[PDB]
Amino acid sequence: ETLGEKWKKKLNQLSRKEFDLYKKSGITEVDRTEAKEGLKRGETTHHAVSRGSAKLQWFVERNMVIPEGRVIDLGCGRGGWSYYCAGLKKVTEVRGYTKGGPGHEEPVPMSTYGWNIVKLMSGKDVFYLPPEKCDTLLCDIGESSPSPTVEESRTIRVLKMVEPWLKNNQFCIKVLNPYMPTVIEHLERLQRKHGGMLVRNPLSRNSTHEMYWISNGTGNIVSSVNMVSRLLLNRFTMTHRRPTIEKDVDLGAGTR
Ligand SMILES: C[S@@+](CC[C@H](N)C(=O)[O-])C[C@H]1O[C@@H](n2cnc3c(N)ncnc32)[C@H](O)[C@@H]1O
Predict the structure, then answer these.
(1) What's the CA-to-centroid distance between 96 and ligand 1, angstroms?
(2) 104 near 244, Cβ under 8 Å?
């Protein structure tokens, strides 16, 4: 039984009250107040459509993934990753795909900087999509479940699905459950082949063990995963630490 499975265990034992306090204890989060109010009023410039823009920004600003050329954004949802990438100088095209329907967030149309190189497509299950030529492959798919065996299946399926889209390109791929032994085996094989490293984003909630496989880095995957399991387990032991609040991203207007 992995450290991660013990964390998962404990998480599942929490009351809703305890869960709600635990999930943000000591994390970082952006202040969405202004964006939500603006989106509520139909504003199409400046605002990120989700917390995802700031989440991907954290990786990009640290050069862990450097979006360039034609960017594919797998499970776009509202489009946070896509609209962010749209403003980056090296990026020439952004194609986002997402399931949508009941479920499942629909793309939100925006006119933030670079919106003209963006096409977001709903009604698209990426497990049935053939791979396309791209210079950057982004994927933020992986639905949490109380069952770590369900999550293991979802995670492995994502890893197998994204591989053909990796063509010596930049990438950032969510790994929903990185602690199950079989997932580690796949990750180790993929890292041998395509390189990169697994990284914990500080904007991730404590309610998920997700880490991101990014292209620009190196390191020991097992050590990084266990570090996260120890972090998340430690956060069970103390009174709720209020999250570190940061400014949300401002995404423009205009064409590129
Ligand atoms: C964590 S959200 C992405 C948030 C996005 N990165 C943003 O910045 O707003 C993952 C998205 O994947 C979508 N999704 C889940 N399974 C999918 C599938 N099989 N094919 C396409 N999209 C999927 C979900 O509907 C959800 O909108």
Answers:
(1) 10
(2) no
Q: What is the CA radius of gyration of the chain?
A: 18
Amino acid at 198: L
Domains of the chain and CATH, by start: 1-256 (3.40.50.150)
Cα–Cα distance, 224 to 129 (Å, whole number): 31
Closest CA to 245 of 18, 78, 24, 22: 24
For residue 208, report the phi and psi dihedrals to the nearest 5 degrees: -135, 140
Q: Which amino acid is at 25?
A: S
Q: Does 207 carry a binding-site annotation?
A: no
> Which residues surround ligand 1 with Cβ inside 6 Å?
50, 52, 75-81, 97-99, 103-105, 124-127, 140-141
**What's the rounded Cα separation, in Å, for the pair 105 and 167?**
29
Answer whether 74's CB lies under 8 Å from 139's CB.
yes
User: Do the strands 197-199 and 211-214 form a parallel or antiparallel pair, or are they unpaired?
Assistant: antiparallel
Assign 3-class secondary structure to the chain.
CCHHHHHHHHHHHCCHHHHHHHCCCCCEEECCHHHHHHHHCCCCCCCCCCCHHHHHHHHHHCCCCCCCEEEEEECCCCCHHHHHHHCCCCEEEEEEECCCCCCCCCCCCCCCCCHHHEEEECCCCHHHCCCCCCCEEEECCCCCCCCHHHHHHHHHHHHHHHHHHCCCCEEEEEECCCCCHHHHHHHHHHHHHHCCEEECCCCCCCCCCCEEEECCCCCCHHHHHHHHHHHHHHCCCCCCCCCEEECCCCCCCCCC
- φ, ψ of residue 89 in degrees (nearest 5): -55, -40
